[PDB]
Ligand binder design. Structure first.
Ligand SMILES: COC1=C2C[C@H](C)C[C@H](OC)[C@H](O)[C@@H](C)/C=C(\C)[C@H](OC(N)=O)[C@@H](OC)/C=C\C=C(/C)C(=O)NC(=CC1=O)C2=O
Length: 213
């Protein structure tokens, strides 16, 4: 059974602002997600300094990108610390965010959407290219949960009984808009990573499907 939660008022405003933007440099969504993944990996690594056993649910530290062309989906996975149900509910929607309103005001004044991460709300950049998102996350401290939003005023959180098991970490599953299908292509993905993510401490893996002939 799913639980439904309302987004804090300014977050809803932010999403609507981002979803309805003709902005021309949307590719920065990937830098933001890779940067979040790297933060989550830094955190499990730092945490394991004083408790090495935390790594054992997923001993490999990586970032993995998987296009699913036939579903028009792009997944970005990490084996970082992941988030508990309570963390997902608290930190991804229901509580007011330090920087939401200030980022919107900066946008109004001519700021580049690229700046969104400097305001601590870069997660929401995913709506530049996706009209719907599932975030699937497994923390060592909780079960696997699915957070979902179509940028309306509410999101859902559901115990996960339908997706592959994550040993530990997070999968961002982006349902791409029809005009943003370029991010399913191996070539384009590599371009964006090389442009915006030159310096990442963790391996970035790209999953590519090809017909044998
Ligand atoms: C500094 O930490 C960051 C914060 C505080 C954030 C709540 C910390 C979070 O608290 C539980 C965990 O400690 C941390 C491990 C989880 C991630 C980095 C998630 O990503 C992945 N791969 O786990 C991230 O994206 C799904 C979650 C939403 C982040 C928000 C709404 C945002 O817009 N930008 C942010 C980017 C950050 O790095 C942000 O606010």
């Amino acid at each position: 059974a799913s639980e439904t939660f309302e987004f804090q008022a300014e977050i809803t405003q932010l999403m609507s602002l981002i979803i309805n933007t003709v902005y021309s440099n949307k590719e920065i969504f990937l830098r933001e997600l890779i940067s979040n993944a790297s933060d989550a990996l830094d955190k499990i690594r730092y945490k394991s300094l004083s408790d090495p056993k935390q790594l054992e649910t997923e001993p490999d530290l990586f970032i993995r990108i998987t296009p699913k062309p036939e579903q028009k989906v792009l997944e970005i996975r990490d084996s970082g610390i992941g988030m508990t149900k309570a963390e997902v509910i608290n930190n991804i929607g229901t509580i007011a965010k330090s920087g939401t309103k200030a980022f919107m005001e900066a946008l109004s004044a001519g700021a580049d959407v690229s700046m969104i991460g400097q305001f601590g709300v870069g997660f929401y950049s995913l709506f530049l290219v996706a009209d719907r998102v599932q975030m699937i996350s497994k923390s060592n401290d909780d079960e696997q949960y699915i957070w979902e939003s179509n940028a309306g005023g509410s999101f859902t959180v559901t115990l996960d009984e339908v997706n592959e098991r994550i040993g530990r970490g997070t999968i961002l599953r982006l349902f791409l808009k029809d005009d943003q299908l370029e991010y399913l292509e191996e070539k384009r993905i590599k371009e964006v990573i090389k442009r915006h993510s030159e310096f990442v401490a963790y391996p970035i893996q790209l999953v590519v499907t090809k017909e044998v002939e």
